[PDB]
Amino acid sequence: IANQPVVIDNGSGVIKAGFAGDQIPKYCFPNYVGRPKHVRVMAGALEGDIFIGPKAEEHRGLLSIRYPMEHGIVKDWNDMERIWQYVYSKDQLQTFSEEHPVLLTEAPLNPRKNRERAAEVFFETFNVPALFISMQAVLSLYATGRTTGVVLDSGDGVTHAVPIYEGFAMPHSIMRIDIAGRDVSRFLRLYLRKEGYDFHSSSEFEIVKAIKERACYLSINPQKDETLETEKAQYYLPDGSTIEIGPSRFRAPELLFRPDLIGEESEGIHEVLVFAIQKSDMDLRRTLFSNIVLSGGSTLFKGFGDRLLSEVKKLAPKDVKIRISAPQERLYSTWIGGSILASLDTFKKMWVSKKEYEEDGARSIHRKTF
Amino acid sequence: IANQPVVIDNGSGVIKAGFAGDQIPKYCFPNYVGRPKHVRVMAGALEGDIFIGPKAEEHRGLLSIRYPMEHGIVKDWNDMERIWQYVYSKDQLQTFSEEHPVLLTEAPLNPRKNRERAAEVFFETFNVPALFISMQAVLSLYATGRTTGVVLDSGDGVTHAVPIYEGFAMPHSIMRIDIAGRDVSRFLRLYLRKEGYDFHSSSEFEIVKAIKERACYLSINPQKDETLETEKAQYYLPDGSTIEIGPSRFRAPELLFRPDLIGEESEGIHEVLVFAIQKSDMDLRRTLFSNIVLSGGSTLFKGFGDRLLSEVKKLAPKDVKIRISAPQERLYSTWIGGSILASLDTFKKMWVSKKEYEEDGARSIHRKTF
Amino acid sequence: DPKYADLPGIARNEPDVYETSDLPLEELTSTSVEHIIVNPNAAYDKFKDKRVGTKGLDFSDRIGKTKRTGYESGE
Amino acid sequence: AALVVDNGSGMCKAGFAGDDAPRAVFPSIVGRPRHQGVMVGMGQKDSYVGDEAQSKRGILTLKYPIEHGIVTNWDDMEKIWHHTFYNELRVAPEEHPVLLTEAPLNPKANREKMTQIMFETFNTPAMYVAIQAVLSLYASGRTTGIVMDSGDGVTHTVPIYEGYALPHAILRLDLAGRDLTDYLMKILTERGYSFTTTAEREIVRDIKEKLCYVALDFEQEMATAASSSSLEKSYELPDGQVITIGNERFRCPEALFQPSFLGMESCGIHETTFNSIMKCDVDIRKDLYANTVLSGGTTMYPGIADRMQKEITALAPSTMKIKIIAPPERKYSVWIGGSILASLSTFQQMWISKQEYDESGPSIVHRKCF
Ligand SMILES: Nc1ncnc2c1ncn2[C@@H]1O[C@H](COP(=O)(O)OP(=O)(O)OP(=O)(O)O)[C@@H](O)[C@H]1O
Ligand SMILES: Nc1ncnc2c1ncn2[C@@H]1O[C@H](COP(=O)(O)OP(=O)(O)O)[C@@H](O)[C@H]1O
Ligand SMILES: Nc1ncnc2c1ncn2[C@@H]1O[C@H](COP(=O)(O)OP(=O)(O)O)[C@@H](O)[C@H]1O
């Protein structure tokens, strides 16, 4: 169509959206559906019963938090349809879901049926003229202007490292473990339960997320600081109650580097990056160690980069210039790269036209997406 | 059939009534049945043995008063039928019961037998074409014209807090203590016996109620009034004598805040509001402390709001804004809001017609109003 | 306003509002990473004239040729 | 010569090692009388503990010291322990090592203050704190299986395969017997029987222990109870008063399977066990579905294994052998297991000696608990 496409950063924590060709996503709202758990009695109360966006955040106590995307995989198609309609409604974009192309981000190595049913929604419920599902790493490289680099991101629920050497993504070195922000938050909830401060409501888990995002520093020395004793700084709840955090503030974000804590054998973030670099070729790992690009909100902890340097220096060979290059608008890097990709003249050649999907279907989707 | 709806605001102490739209209930009187002391054998005395309101207040030392409602539960249904008939009689409304819609009030957590028997009366004796047994907190919110708020009403027998957040009533956050004005008067009589005067009759107990309503102040520190000597403000009895009350005027309203001093187990008014807020969600307490709605006649003590502010400051966390909204129409906020709610156009779906009640019966009431 | 005269218990000198005094990031500045300022204009000007040829490509698990390399041409 | 004390949020099952049934079986309740200015004369105690407070319950205020497995008042718990040691077993704790049972996922402060009290106050030589589910599995005569313990304040599930625990697949739910008591109290108030004070809570829990059973098909049983009336049984209070309960019998333990009746926003006990099984390894789920062990006093409801088996059967796959193990001695499973453990020839190295507490302190419990 002779209009501008929509770049939807379909993340698991914050489903960022906006029109292509912009510079900052104008509509950033969390990825959850809010349904009231109480019973309305007094007239003139709120209606709709399905709160999404700032309405759910403004009134958390009324509704029950339910996430539709668990570890990057859509688990509630009805909730994702409602969130997508919420994006196309007058409260978020006011346009039509049948007069603009859609740039839908997606984590790598996801199941095939997610892509299939996602395009089924966008081409059957919504009748979009063109849909192009894409990786998050390529988009981050698009936004950073680089072409090389290993994109090590960590969103709310999926951590992965996709090495790319001048636009040639190696589809076998891609590592991906489902241990990120939401799971770290859940582990933090467990730690807080061990401390004495319990939180069990769904509308209270986001308060736990706020505690995760405010005072959680990653220590350089894990066991050396584990055997010590901190000063136990406090935190202020929205209720006004004061909570002493204790050792959970540094023992909870270590899950990204020790997935054994949650009780699941896998690799840490540093092992994900190092194995993603070592699964590549000999003549490419020097540039990839010198070109590491971060992304994702779970990489914003205090001391995350320092601990990555320590771990990588422990694993990478000696005398190799390691360079971690993270951006400043880390939470919006994927969306900015989506804006740059969708604002290109060549973007019309790489999507999936509606007629193409009507002619073939799933095969065309898998044929045009990575 | 349709006419002007009547808001029969019941209650343990003062049954109030009046048509919708009216901002003042023109027919208010204390809720009781008057019968003479000596059993009648002939005429020449208080004939008919049935006095209510003005004719009940016509004579005091010649009547035995029997309350029909205790703690919001109707014990004598015949007496309530006679009081409702008195409302429909030649002295209170002079209207027809089978023509006007009738709104009804009830305290929360009441037994189902009360509602079933009340509808049996209002659909068999007085065949009212529209009956909606509403609550007693939601109505105060309609009167104040406020969405949020913690309604803390205090009638003659029940004090209950129901924190309603924007039309959503949380049923599990309801605290209900069976202590109020009638028990305040009973323990006031108990303290008056320590002063020197004694009362031993129901009408004499209403004289004690008049003593309570004229002078009963709540100091922030009752021990300061205990150490000092009060000036013993006199009170001209209705019989013609005078009584120097003394310290019992302030020792009696301590019941609602410290019922453990007498020997009864409860939490108190301040703890009813505090525990009602604490049972709510973590994200709503900051707004529920700043939205406190008072109601009922027992909240009419000198210094009630100041002592309630001090006790809430003791229990609630620090730096939390509290706004105990004390309206002027507290004795009629339930009736005023009932008139506002009954005057609405959406209110048509709330009631139940006579035929609709005859369809099922009890289940029809409980299904349509809840 | 006229609810004072017509009703007995509606008292005056009532402070309607009992209240209290209404009393009145650092993670990007690390020495490990190299913070990069994202500029969509510079990146858009960089990738302004770079075409992508999608003539007969595949990404699925179809094994007919030897290898499979999508996005062949350009400008 | 070891002491096995099972301190739950309700009863306090205590006795000697090697014994089959415990000696001390009493409700862990403390109670101060109604403090009034009047006197008593001819002596009485200051705080009745155990059956003393259970028989003199007409005037004292029942205050449990443990709320949801958390010792909320160490002085009251110290009084119960002193009463147990020097009055129910009639033996000083210095000549014997003790064995305490705590709930899993218990806040560390309880697990440490318990040790501090057992060493500094009673001068005990050795104390070990074991998880109640582990002991229930010991008493069930199996080394493989999942324990669905349910106390009055806590309810948890712990899977143990071949003697090894899974500390990450352990769930915990606060929806236990005391919450059921509160729910039954509220619905009995709804049927017209106000059980307000704490002294009435023992009567309503007695009703729960005597006439409450688990319905198989709750909707069908509820429809037949609303249709017929043969299910309505009678019960006598301590007074000559007699009551009748129709729905309450089967609707009281329905909260265990449906936590939405209490607004918990959680999963029922059946799906809690299901999720605890699913969080384990995929190769050992057959044994867990076969060796499902119930324990605690809240599983003593008549006809509960059928409900658990039906619900798990509906949840677990069709090719699984769903088997529920419910021994008639499951009310003392934790104590029996404590007896077995304390009398083992290997357990002597598993203690915590006095000098170990003298050297390390309260932090040795976490390295020696489990
Ligand atoms: N026959 C019965 N039917 C239903 N519930 C019962 C029955 N007998 C006892 N109960 C309930 O079981 C609970 C007994 O708790 P329990 O025996 O589990 O001790 P506890 O203090 O919870 O410690 P633990 O969980 O370690 O045993 C009480 O709340 C009681 O209400
Ligand atoms: N300062 C912080 N410390 C730790 N975690 C954070 C911080 N800021 C954001 N997060 C986490 O990062 C997540 C957002 O990451 P993001 O890459 O946006 O996920 P998605 O791509 O799914 O939206 C949030 O779930 C939040 O928990
Ligand atoms: N000015 C007052 N001072 C003291 N007590 C009062 C005052 N006004 C009313 N009361 C008490 O409050 C009761 C009236 O409260 P109300 O809300 O009308 O009760 P109900 O809702 O049961 O009719 C009376 O029984 C009386 O004991």
CSV table of N, CA, C and O in Angstrom, one decimal, chain B residues 62-115:
chain,number,residue,atom,x,y,z
B,62,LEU,N,-44.5,5.5,80.4
B,62,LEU,CA,-45.6,4.6,80.3
B,62,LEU,C,-45.5,3.6,79.2
B,62,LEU,O,-46.5,3.1,78.7
B,63,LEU,N,-44.3,3.3,78.8
B,63,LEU,CA,-44.2,2.4,77.6
B,63,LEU,C,-43.0,1.4,77.8
B,63,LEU,O,-42.0,1.7,78.5
B,64,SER,N,-43.1,0.2,77.3
B,64,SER,CA,-42.1,-0.8,77.2
B,64,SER,C,-41.8,-1.0,75.8
B,64,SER,O,-42.7,-1.3,74.9
B,65,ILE,N,-40.6,-0.6,75.4
B,65,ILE,CA,-40.1,-0.6,74.0
B,65,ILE,C,-39.4,-1.9,73.7
B,65,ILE,O,-38.6,-2.4,74.4
B,66,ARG,N,-39.7,-2.4,72.5
B,66,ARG,CA,-39.1,-3.6,72.0
B,66,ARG,C,-38.5,-3.3,70.6
B,66,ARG,O,-39.2,-3.0,69.7
B,67,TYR,N,-37.2,-3.5,70.5
B,67,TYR,CA,-36.6,-3.2,69.2
B,67,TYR,C,-36.8,-4.4,68.3
B,67,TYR,O,-36.7,-5.6,68.7
B,68,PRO,N,-37.2,-4.1,67.0
B,68,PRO,CA,-37.4,-5.2,66.1
B,68,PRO,C,-36.2,-5.7,65.4
B,68,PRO,O,-36.1,-6.9,64.9
B,69,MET,N,-35.2,-4.9,65.3
B,69,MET,CA,-33.9,-5.2,64.6
B,69,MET,C,-32.7,-5.1,65.5
B,69,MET,O,-32.6,-4.0,66.1
B,70,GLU,N,-31.9,-6.1,65.6
B,70,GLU,CA,-30.7,-6.1,66.4
B,70,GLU,C,-29.6,-6.6,65.6
B,70,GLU,O,-29.7,-7.7,65.0
B,71,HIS,N,-28.5,-5.8,65.5
B,71,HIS,CA,-27.3,-6.1,64.7
B,71,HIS,C,-27.6,-6.3,63.3
B,71,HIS,O,-27.0,-7.1,62.6
B,72,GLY,N,-28.6,-5.5,62.8
B,72,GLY,CA,-29.0,-5.7,61.4
B,72,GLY,C,-29.8,-6.9,61.1
B,72,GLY,O,-30.3,-7.0,59.9
B,73,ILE,N,-30.1,-7.7,62.0
B,73,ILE,CA,-30.9,-9.0,61.8
B,73,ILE,C,-32.2,-8.7,62.5
B,73,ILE,O,-32.3,-8.3,63.6
B,74,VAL,N,-33.3,-9.0,61.7
B,74,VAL,CA,-34.6,-8.9,62.2
B,74,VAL,C,-35.0,-10.0,63.1
B,74,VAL,O,-35.1,-11.2,62.6
B,75,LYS,N,-35.3,-9.8,64.4
B,75,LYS,CA,-35.7,-10.8,65.3
B,75,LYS,C,-37.2,-11.0,65.3
B,75,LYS,O,-37.8,-12.1,65.2
B,76,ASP,N,-38.0,-9.8,65.4
B,76,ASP,CA,-39.4,-9.8,65.4
B,76,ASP,C,-39.9,-9.3,64.0
B,76,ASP,O,-39.8,-8.1,63.7
B,77,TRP,N,-40.3,-10.2,63.2
B,77,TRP,CA,-40.7,-9.8,61.8
B,77,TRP,C,-42.1,-9.1,61.9
B,77,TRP,O,-42.3,-8.3,61.0
B,78,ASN,N,-42.9,-9.5,62.8
B,78,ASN,CA,-44.2,-8.8,63.0
B,78,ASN,C,-44.1,-7.4,63.3
B,78,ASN,O,-44.8,-6.5,62.8
B,79,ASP,N,-43.1,-7.0,64.2
B,79,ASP,CA,-42.8,-5.7,64.5
B,79,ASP,C,-42.3,-4.9,63.3
B,79,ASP,O,-42.7,-3.7,63.1
B,80,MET,N,-41.5,-5.5,62.5
B,80,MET,CA,-41.0,-4.8,61.3
B,80,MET,C,-42.1,-4.6,60.3
B,80,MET,O,-42.1,-3.6,59.6
B,81,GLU,N,-43.1,-5.6,60.2
B,81,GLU,CA,-44.2,-5.4,59.4
B,81,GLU,C,-45.1,-4.2,59.8
B,81,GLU,O,-45.5,-3.5,59.0
B,82,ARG,N,-45.2,-4.1,61.1
B,82,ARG,CA,-46.0,-3.0,61.7
B,82,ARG,C,-45.3,-1.7,61.5
B,82,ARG,O,-45.9,-0.6,61.2
B,83,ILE,N,-43.9,-1.6,61.5
B,83,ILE,CA,-43.2,-0.4,61.3
B,83,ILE,C,-43.3,0.0,59.8
B,83,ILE,O,-43.4,1.2,59.5
B,84,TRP,N,-43.2,-1.0,58.9
B,84,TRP,CA,-43.3,-0.7,57.5
B,84,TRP,C,-44.7,-0.3,57.1
B,84,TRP,O,-44.9,0.6,56.3
B,85,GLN,N,-45.7,-0.9,57.8
B,85,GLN,CA,-47.0,-0.5,57.6
B,85,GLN,C,-47.3,0.9,58.2
B,85,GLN,O,-48.1,1.7,57.7
B,86,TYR,N,-46.5,1.3,59.2
B,86,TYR,CA,-46.6,2.6,59.8
B,86,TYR,C,-46.0,3.6,58.8
B,86,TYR,O,-46.4,4.8,58.7
B,87,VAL,N,-45.0,3.2,58.0
B,87,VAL,CA,-44.4,4.1,57.0
B,87,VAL,C,-45.5,4.3,55.9
B,87,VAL,O,-45.6,5.4,55.4
B,88,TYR,N,-46.2,3.2,55.6
B,88,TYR,CA,-47.3,3.4,54.6
B,88,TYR,C,-48.6,3.9,55.2
B,88,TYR,O,-49.5,4.2,54.5
B,89,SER,N,-48.6,4.1,56.5
B,89,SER,CA,-49.8,4.6,57.2
B,89,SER,C,-50.1,6.0,56.9
B,89,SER,O,-49.4,6.7,56.2
B,90,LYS,N,-51.2,6.5,57.5
B,90,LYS,CA,-51.7,7.9,57.4
B,90,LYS,C,-50.8,8.9,58.0
B,90,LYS,O,-51.2,10.1,57.8
B,91,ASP,N,-49.8,8.6,58.7
B,91,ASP,CA,-48.9,9.6,59.3
B,91,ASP,C,-47.6,9.8,58.6
B,91,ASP,O,-46.9,10.8,58.8
B,92,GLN,N,-47.1,8.8,57.8
B,92,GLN,CA,-45.8,8.9,57.2
B,92,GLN,C,-45.8,9.1,55.7
B,92,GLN,O,-45.1,9.9,55.2
B,93,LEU,N,-46.6,8.4,54.9
B,93,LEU,CA,-46.5,8.6,53.5
B,93,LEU,C,-47.9,8.8,52.8
B,93,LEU,O,-48.0,9.6,51.9
B,94,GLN,N,-48.9,8.1,53.4
B,94,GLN,CA,-50.3,8.2,52.9
B,94,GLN,C,-50.4,7.7,51.5
B,94,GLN,O,-51.3,8.2,50.7
B,95,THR,N,-49.5,6.8,51.1
B,95,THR,CA,-49.5,6.3,49.7
B,95,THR,C,-49.9,4.8,49.7
B,95,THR,O,-50.3,4.2,50.7
B,96,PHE,N,-49.8,4.2,48.5
B,96,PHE,CA,-50.2,2.8,48.3
B,96,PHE,C,-49.0,2.0,48.1
B,96,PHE,O,-48.0,2.3,47.3
B,97,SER,N,-48.9,0.9,48.8
B,97,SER,CA,-47.8,-0.1,48.7
B,97,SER,C,-47.7,-0.8,47.4
B,97,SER,O,-46.6,-1.1,46.9
B,98,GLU,N,-48.8,-1.1,46.8
B,98,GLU,CA,-48.9,-1.8,45.5
B,98,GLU,C,-48.8,-0.9,44.3
B,98,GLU,O,-49.2,-1.3,43.2
B,99,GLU,N,-48.2,0.3,44.5
B,99,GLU,CA,-48.1,1.2,43.4
B,99,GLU,C,-46.6,1.8,43.3
B,99,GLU,O,-46.2,2.0,42.2
B,100,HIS,N,-46.0,2.0,44.3
B,100,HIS,CA,-44.7,2.6,44.3
B,100,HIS,C,-43.6,1.6,44.4
B,100,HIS,O,-43.7,0.6,45.0
B,101,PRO,N,-42.5,1.9,43.7
B,101,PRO,CA,-41.3,1.0,43.8
B,101,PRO,C,-40.7,1.2,45.2
B,101,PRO,O,-40.7,2.3,45.7
B,102,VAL,N,-40.1,0.2,45.8
B,102,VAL,CA,-39.5,0.3,47.1
B,102,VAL,C,-38.1,-0.2,47.1
B,102,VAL,O,-37.9,-1.4,46.7
B,103,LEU,N,-37.2,0.6,47.5
B,103,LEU,CA,-35.8,0.3,47.6
B,103,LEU,C,-35.6,-0.2,49.1
B,103,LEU,O,-36.4,0.2,49.9
B,104,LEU,N,-34.7,-1.1,49.3
B,104,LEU,CA,-34.5,-1.6,50.6
B,104,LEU,C,-33.0,-1.7,50.9
B,104,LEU,O,-32.2,-1.9,50.0
B,105,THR,N,-32.6,-1.4,52.2
B,105,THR,CA,-31.2,-1.5,52.6
B,105,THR,C,-31.0,-2.6,53.6
B,105,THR,O,-31.9,-3.0,54.3
B,106,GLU,N,-29.7,-3.1,53.5
B,106,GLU,CA,-29.3,-4.2,54.4
B,106,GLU,C,-27.8,-4.1,54.6
B,106,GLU,O,-27.1,-3.7,53.7
B,107,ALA,N,-27.4,-4.5,55.8
B,107,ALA,CA,-26.0,-4.5,56.2
B,107,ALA,C,-25.4,-5.7,55.4
B,107,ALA,O,-26.1,-6.7,55.2
B,108,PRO,N,-24.1,-5.7,55.1
B,108,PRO,CA,-23.5,-6.9,54.4
B,108,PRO,C,-23.4,-8.1,55.4
B,108,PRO,O,-23.5,-8.0,56.6
B,109,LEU,N,-23.1,-9.2,54.8
B,109,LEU,CA,-23.0,-10.5,55.4
B,109,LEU,C,-24.2,-11.0,56.2
B,109,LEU,O,-24.1,-11.8,57.1
B,110,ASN,N,-25.4,-10.4,55.9
B,110,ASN,CA,-26.6,-10.8,56.6
B,110,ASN,C,-27.1,-12.2,56.2
B,110,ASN,O,-26.8,-12.7,55.1
B,111,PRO,N,-27.8,-12.9,57.1
B,111,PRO,CA,-28.3,-14.2,56.7
B,111,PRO,C,-29.3,-14.2,55.6
B,111,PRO,O,-30.0,-13.2,55.5
B,112,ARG,N,-29.4,-15.3,54.8
B,112,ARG,CA,-30.3,-15.3,53.7
B,112,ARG,C,-31.8,-15.4,54.2
B,112,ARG,O,-32.6,-14.9,53.4
B,113,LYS,N,-32.0,-15.9,55.4
B,113,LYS,CA,-33.4,-15.9,55.9
B,113,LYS,C,-34.0,-14.5,56.0
B,113,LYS,O,-35.2,-14.4,55.8
B,114,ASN,N,-33.2,-13.5,56.4
B,114,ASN,CA,-33.6,-12.2,56.5
B,114,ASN,C,-34.1,-11.6,55.1
B,114,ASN,O,-35.2,-11.1,55.0
B,115,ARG,N,-33.3,-11.8,54.1
B,115,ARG,CA,-33.7,-11.4,52.7
B,115,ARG,C,-34.9,-12.1,52.2
B,115,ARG,O,-35.8,-11.5,51.6
